[PDB]
Amino acid sequence: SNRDFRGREQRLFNSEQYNYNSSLNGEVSVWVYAYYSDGSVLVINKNSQYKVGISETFKVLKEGSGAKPRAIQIIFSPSVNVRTIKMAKGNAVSVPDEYLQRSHPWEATGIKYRKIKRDGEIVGYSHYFELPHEYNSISLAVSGVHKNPSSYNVGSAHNVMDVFQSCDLALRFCNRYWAELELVNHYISPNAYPYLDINNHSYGVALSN
Amino acid sequence: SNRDFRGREQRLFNSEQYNYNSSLNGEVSVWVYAYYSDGSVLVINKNSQYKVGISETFKVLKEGSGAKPRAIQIIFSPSVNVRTIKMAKGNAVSVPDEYLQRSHPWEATGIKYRKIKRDGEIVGYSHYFELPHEYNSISLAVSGVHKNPSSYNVGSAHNVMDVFQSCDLALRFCNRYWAELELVNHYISPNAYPYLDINNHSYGVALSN
Amino acid sequence: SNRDFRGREQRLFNSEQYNYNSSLNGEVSVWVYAYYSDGSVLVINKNSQYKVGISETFKVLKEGSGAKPRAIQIIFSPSVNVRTIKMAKGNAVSVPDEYLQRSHPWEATGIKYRKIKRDGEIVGYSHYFELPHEYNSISLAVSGVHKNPSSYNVGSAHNVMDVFQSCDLALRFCNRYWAELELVNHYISPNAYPYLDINNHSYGVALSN
């Protein structure tokens, strides 16, 4: 019966979480997972309103003696507008991508992002690429804009200062895990984050509807 | 007599400093003081035009073996618009505040800021909060916008690039002091910064009028 | 003859590189070279669309026991609008420039920038200043805006979010070289960057026309 208000409230509880996230009041989140030759995983996460981005350098461990980055997986929350996703990369600690005079400052990589799904629902977006063995490090920057459900100008006369503030307010986290197993068990799963593991298995929590 | 031009110029000297600061040509400044279990104090200061903010992580010293953060005091210069103040925090190195799906990206904490006064003049604003003993660290972000004395649109077609530049131009300082006494004697007082100590004593310099 | 299409294409190849850089699709780049008492050189480079800036602290090596910064050379790519260049500095790890109440948040230093030329062509802009011996460090911030060839409003309703993204996407590099010779041989020259050495010799590559 629909006299089951406990069930109805539980249903609304989950749904409202899903919907608040995709409102412009909600966060847009990016994760950069760097996979090292020793099986360890380094993750950078930043969460912010309106837009979010990361600019990082992943270096060979122990002054060049330890493990080296082998691959990168970039994850965006479902609140991102996939068409706004941009990436700039260098394979070096020294401006790797050809010459400044001829470089485009970014590529629109949205079309390469796969949908991470649980129960038919999009829990995130994933772009995975491996690094050339010939390289010991990668400088990488990625950026995404929150879906704008309306025709609302977040960058209009009055609203632009809020976006400037969003830049100050963004929170960044950096963690290293010993293996993807630890990553899944202690980072991804407990926080209900979207993820694809090495076996192409999807993680995350469907909240709609 | 008002034939005392030395006195009159001294009066204008002080007043002009007070007033330039609160003009849009002046700085808005934020300080984040982190109080550690060993009595030491770590301070982060950033100063910038138009708006300013800080995003930091305060961790337990010596890889988790040393002292731990116990409390935070956030200070804004008098040039801040208290109503624009925003704060986002996590108690963890891992996205502490519940779940991303349900998180508001900030809280307006202005109403909790006390006025730091010297001689009846507001020299700054202070928000103090203690950290749960149960936690070994805190990731914290705070943001404030300069008071806009006029109806001037700093984020208008032409002026927005200046605000973007203000972001590049902001200066950040990080210092650690052995005790609040050292902090007061060698940081707060010499630089004429506003402050409240553990005994609720106010520091700073009245310049008006 | 103009039947030499190999020559004509080579000519267009070089020219197009020059021109793309100065289009709003191209990068604006800044370098900050810090010259240390031991002859070593530390360089910070950031490259980004629309505008670029750096905010750094150059400290005495080995916790204050090693070499100390003696001089700074700031280089901008030719795509910068020299009139938009701004600099804010402190000689301390503690808000060096007088008192916050009376500080202008930056100086327009464009008029002090020399043109670095190769073959009559501007390959960059250079501002060089020495540091007071009395100081062990310098906190420095510099900012420049890309030349806007048109009357195009990059900070208009729609375009402002792209500039916000440009902030996320900017790539920063930090390198230390043992002597200016190494710097020239392994950093400046291989990457075709503009530069002036200690003997006032100009480096870079003319690409026009």
Author numbering:
A (entry chain A), B (entry chain A), C (entry chain A): 8 to 70, 101 to 246
Original paper wording:
Cypoviruses, members of the family Reoviridae, subfamily Spinareovirus, possess a single capsid layer with turrets and are commonly embedded in crystalline occlusion bodies called polyhedra, which are formed in the cell cytoplasm and mainly composed of a single virus-encoded protein, polyhedrin. To ensure the delivery of virus particles to the target intestinal cells, allowing the transmission of packages of infectious virus between hosts by oral-faecal routes, polyhedra are disrupted only when they are exposed to the very alkaline pH environment found in insect midguts. The fold of all the polyhedrins is highly similar – a β-barrel core sitting on a base domain, surrounded by a common array of five helices (H1–H5). The strongest intermolecular interactions define a trimer composed of a cluster of three β-barrels sandwiched by helices top and bottom.
Base domain deletion mutants of CPV1 (CPV1Δ) and CPV4 (CPV4Δ) were produced by three steps of PCR using primers encoding a Gly-Ser-Gly linker (described in). To test this, polyhedrin proteins were made with the base domain removed by deleting residues 74–110 of CPV4 and 71–103 of CPV1 and replacing them with a flexible Gly-Ser-Gly linker (resulting in CPV4Δ and CPV1Δ respectively). Compared to wild-type CPV1, CPV1Δ crystals also had a slightly enlarged unit cell (103.9 vs. 103.0 Å). The absence of the base domain did not influence the overall structure of the trimeric building block but increased flexibility such that the electron density for 40–50 residues in the inter-trimer contact areas could not be observed. These disordered regions include the areas in CPV1 which had been shown previously to bind NTPs, so that NTPs are absent from CPV1Δ. The base domain is therefore a region that is neither required for proper folding of the protein, nor for crystal assembly, but fine-tunes the crystal, ‘locking-down’ the structure, often in conjunction with NTPs. In contrast in the base domain deletion mutants all major cavities are connected, resulting in contiguous solvent channels running through the crystal lattice. The deletion mutants are much more sensitive to alkaline buffers, even those such as glycine and borate which do not disrupt crystals of full-length polyhedrin, although CAPS could not dissolve any of the samples effectively. We also find that the whole base domain is dispensable for polyhedra formation, although the biochemical features are altered dramatically when it is removed.
